């Protein structure tokens, strides 16, 4: 294989991108849950 | 990263590659 280490770095960054997107979605979902609880209490 | 090498040179050292091939001090 030619240029192995750069390909390995590319793969590591590619999986890191997916992990970061997933974490952002977790934060969004938690915010949604909080807002829904408040809305349910008020209604 | 890639291409992070320090080059060691190795020279074949022997009688032929030193000029001492057939060295004689007698006939």
């Amino acid at each position: 294989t030619t240029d192995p280490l750069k390909a390995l770095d590319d793969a590591i960054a590619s999986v890191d991108k997916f992990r970061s997107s997933l974490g952002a979605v977790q934060n969004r979902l938690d915010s949604a849950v909080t807002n829904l609880n408040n809305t349910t209490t008020n209604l | 990263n890639d291409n992070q090498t320090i080059t060691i040179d190795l020279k074949q050292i022997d009688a032929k590659t030193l000029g001492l091939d057939g060295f004689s001090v007698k006939n």
Partner: protein
């Protein structure tokens, strides 16, 4: 931090590798020293023979 982890592992492994080259240099230097001793003895014997 993942990038630091990768960098640290790679750098440590590279230093471990460089130690091997140091060992190779030492071994070949020992061999060369033996050859040099033989050459000096041969030179002295040629001086005695001429």
């Amino acid at each position: 931090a993942n990038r630091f982890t990768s960098n640290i592992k790679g750098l440590t492994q590279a230093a471990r590798n460089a130690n091997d080259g140091i060992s190779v240099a030492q071994t070949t230097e020992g061999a060369l020293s033996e050859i040099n001793n033989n050459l000096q003895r041969v030179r002295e014997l040629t001086v005695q023979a001429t």
